[PDB]
Design a protein around this nucleic acid. Structure first.
Length: 195
DNA sequence: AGCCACATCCCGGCACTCGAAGTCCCCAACTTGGATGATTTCTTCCAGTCCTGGTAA
């Protein structure tokens, strides 16, 4: 009904109401997968405790699935889709309606993590994590901008395309084609703002 | 003006894009002069047989 908080240590304890609503919606689909039992009070009541160690737990949830994915590998990683390892955790960032990083704190932590992941895995002769392919709609989300802007950014040569398409065809938004390390670096280099 | 049957209608849901290099453009295509003569084109003999009318003196 209102916020009214002070000494807001948890990442769920600050902000405008729309964000506070979005954070709960996200928590629910992701951890309350059990079918509705109209436990309208009890089901959501737990979300606050959950977030109290967030700055240090979210990363472990992401780390766990890097390893479980790795041991099930069937192709060299540089032809593997980003989605096969992280399971659309990126798309879920779109459920909070705000676009910028300083307000959408879920996206802010996911990017933090991916930047570190790339940093500890530099390029060498054998491919490794960080060379995964992103689709056009994924870069748009990580770069905090609409899709048409990515097409314009490609056209000017600020980033490379890795898969050669056939002639008399087009690459659709859903096709996986940019390397992760290329997107992370470009964003640090030329996409920052006061937000 | 109040009550009832039947039309559709929009959100939540679901499923698909889809592997995976490109194979050269352009403009022209021939004019003149003649096609042969002299000769001849076969002859002997033969060319089946039997069955399958109606009507009135």
């Amino acid at each position: 009904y209102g916020c009214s908080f002070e000494s807001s240590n948890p990442l769920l304890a600050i902000g405008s109401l729309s964000a506070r609503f979005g954070a709960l919606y996200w928590y629910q689909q992701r951890y309350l997968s059990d079918h509705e039992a109209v436990r309208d009070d009890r089901a959501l009541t737990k979300a606050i405790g959950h977030f109290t160690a967030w700055p240090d737990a979210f990363w472990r949830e992401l780390q766990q699935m890097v390893d479980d994915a790795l041991v099930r590998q069937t192709k060299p990683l540089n032809h593997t889709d980003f989605v096969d390892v992280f399971g659309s955790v990126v798309a879920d960032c779109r459920q909070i309606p705000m676009r910028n990083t300083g307000q959408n704190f879920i996206l802010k932590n996911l990017i933090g993590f991916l930047t570190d992941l790339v940093a500890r895995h530099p390029q060498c002769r054998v491919a490794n994590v960080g060379d995964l392919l992103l689709s056009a709609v994924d870069a748009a989300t990580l770069l905090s901008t609409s899709v048409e802007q990515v097409r314009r950014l490609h056209h000017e040569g600020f980033l490379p395309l890795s898969i050669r398409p056939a002639s008399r065809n087009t690459v659709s938004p859903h096709r996986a084609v940019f390397h992760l390390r290329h997107v992370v670096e470009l964003r640090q280099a030329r996409m920052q703002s006061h937000h």
